[PDB]
């Protein structure tokens, strides 16, 4: 009924800050595994 397309990150409160920190922590861990595998395949 009501519009709620991305209302958690648009608020900026407790739920908004926790959603941005969870996505940044998961992307930082996956970037370390992708960078180490790309350097070993080039040599």
């Amino acid at each position: 009924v009501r519009s709620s397309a991305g209302a958690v990150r648009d608020a900026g409160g407790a739920f908004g800050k926790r959603e941005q920190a969870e996505e940044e922590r998961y992307f930082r861990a996956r970037a370390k595994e992708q960078l180490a595998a790309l350097k070993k395949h080039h040599e």
């Binding site: 926790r18 941005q20 920190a21 940044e24 922590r25 930082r28 861990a29 370390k32």
Partner: protein
């Protein structure tokens, strides 16, 4: 359904002979009250002219009608009655200026309120003056050292820019402007006129005890000899507090047009908007938004546009504007808050959440920004702290992951430990400004990872021990960063070797 002007009393004088006395240079007060004073006459009086009543109170004719003339009194309306003579001075609303005004607490009209006799004024400048054009202005290239370690590395201000200071009450609004004026004592006490910056505190809307406490602290630290104090308390009339911004800007403009630097502090911007709406509502005028006047945004933009850096053909001076915005509960989307943030070149947000925990001053790195960039900062502080703006955003996202239960990420352990020590080292105490030589050595040891092996509680003791050892042993490295203002290949190798050997006692 009728009209004013000619009514009963004024309608019985035009039927016989209304002459004899002149009604152009003088006028009779028909009605007065609540600061306003409707003077009947004054045909030769111009707009925004200084009017003198018969009791001694000054007036400013701002509303000129066809039968009357609405004048705003600059003092108390208890001595002005109906039928009093209101003479015209012939000039506009002017104020005193010159180099002799430094050292005395003047008011809104140039009168001395400190009790030091008369003011040695060298000229007479009007309050409502025009701002500088695009041809008589240059880029902001000078550096305004405020003294704070978290303001000189993040949002650095320069000579000629307008930096706002938004925030709530008791958060660090007035403390940021007072620390920048006291930090200029190292350049004003010498002989270099190009590096000195004169202060201009304009206390508008404050109480009587707040203006006397701020002037007493600057005189004891050798800082009131080159600073203009504009006393404008809230116990006076509405016309004296609203004209405090225009009167303080005229005195500081004399130094920028000759070859010196000035620094104006309009504390606060929220008090000036309430004083202008009170005098306009009593003069029979229509209101606008939030019970304010129509030209609410034009009153604050015209007074801040004059504080700009001049070019080399105009003298080479500049004027810094420090307007403090008093918010209500951190709400920056108000009517007077959004109007001043879109006219100034950057703002300093002062949140009330980090100010109560002990991080003084509470300067948000993710909200406060500078429109000048790295051009308004020194070359020595920009080399050692080149990644200071990027380290604050990365440390904020990694600090929230510790409260979720995650204890992994071995590569992120170095960035999380360095972010906590960098925030505590940049937080200085009250009336404790640092120079460019002491702030360049503290920012290099926290950004290169040399402060990661130290404790969090010993961050306050490490700043005093590092500055004391560099002034008695390796004194040549501290003097080169202040005179040259930069660091080449020889200065970078000597600063890194001295910081590593000093960490082991």
């Amino acid at each position: 359904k009728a009209a004013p002007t000619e009514v009963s009393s004024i309608l019985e004088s035009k039927i016989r002979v209304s002459d004899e006395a002149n009604l152009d240079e003088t006028g009779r007060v028909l009605s007065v009250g609540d600061g306003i004073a409707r003077v009947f006459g004054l045909n030769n009086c111009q707009a925004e002219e200084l009017v003198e009543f018969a009791s001694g109170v000054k007036g400013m004719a701002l509303n000129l009608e066809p039968g009357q003339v609405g004048i705003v009194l600059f003092g108390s309306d208890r001595e002005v009655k109906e039928g009093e003579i209101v003479k015209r001075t012939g000039k506009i609303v002017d104020v005193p200026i010159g180099p002799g005004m430094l050292g005395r607490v003047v008011d809104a009209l140039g009168n001395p309120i400190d009790g030091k006799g008369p003011i040695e004024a060298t000229g007479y400048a009007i309050a409502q003056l025009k701002a500088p054009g695009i041809l008589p202005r240059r880029s902001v290239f000078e550096p305004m050292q405020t003294g704070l370690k978290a303001v000189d590395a993040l949002v650095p201000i320069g000579r000629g820019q307008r930096e706002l200071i938004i925030g709530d009450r008791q958060t660090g609004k007035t403390a940021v402007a007072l620390d920048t004026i006291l930090n200029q004592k190292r350049w004003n006490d010498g002989n270099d006129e190009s590096k000195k910056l004169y202060c201009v505190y304009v206390a508008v809307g404050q109480k009587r005890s707040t203006v006397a406490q701020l002037v007493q602290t600057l005189e004891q630290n050798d800082a009131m000899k080159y600073s203009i104090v504009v006393a404008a308390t809230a116990s006076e009339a509405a016309p004296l507090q609203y004209l405090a911004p225009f009167t303080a800007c005229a005195i500081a403009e004399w130094f920028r047009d000759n070859g010196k630097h000035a620094l104006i502090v309009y504390d606060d911007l929220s008090k000036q908007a309430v004083a202008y709406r009170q005098l306009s509502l009593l003069l029979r005028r229509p209101p606008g938004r939030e019970a304010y006047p129509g030209d609410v945004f034009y009153l604050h933009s015209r007074l801040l546009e004059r504080a700009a850096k001049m070019s080399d053909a105009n003298g080479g001076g500049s004027l810094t504007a420090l307007p403090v915005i008093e918010t209500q509960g951190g709400d920056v989307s108000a009517y007077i808050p959004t109007n001043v943030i879109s006219i100034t070149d950057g703002q300093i947000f002062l949140e009330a959440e980090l100010f109560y925990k002990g991080i003084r001053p509470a300067i948000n790195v993710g909200l406060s920004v500078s429109r000048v960039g790295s051009a308004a900062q020194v070359k020595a502080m920009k080399q050692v702290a080149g990644s200071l703006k990027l380290f604050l955003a990365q440390y904020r996202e990694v600090a929230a992951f510790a409260q979720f239960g995650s204890d992994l990420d071995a590569s992120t352990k170095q960035t999380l430990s360095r972010g906590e020590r960098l925030t505590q080292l940049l937080k200085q105490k009250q009336y404790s400004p640092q120079a460019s030589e002491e702030q360049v050595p503290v920012i290099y040891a926290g950004v290169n990872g040399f402060l990661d092996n130290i404790p969090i509680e010993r961050i306050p003791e490490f700043e005093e021990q590092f500055i004391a050892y560099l002034k008695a042993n390796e004194g040549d490295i501290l003097e080169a960063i202040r005179t040259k203002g930069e660091l080449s290949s020889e200065l970078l190798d000597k600063l890194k070797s001295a910081t590593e050997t000093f960490v082991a006692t």
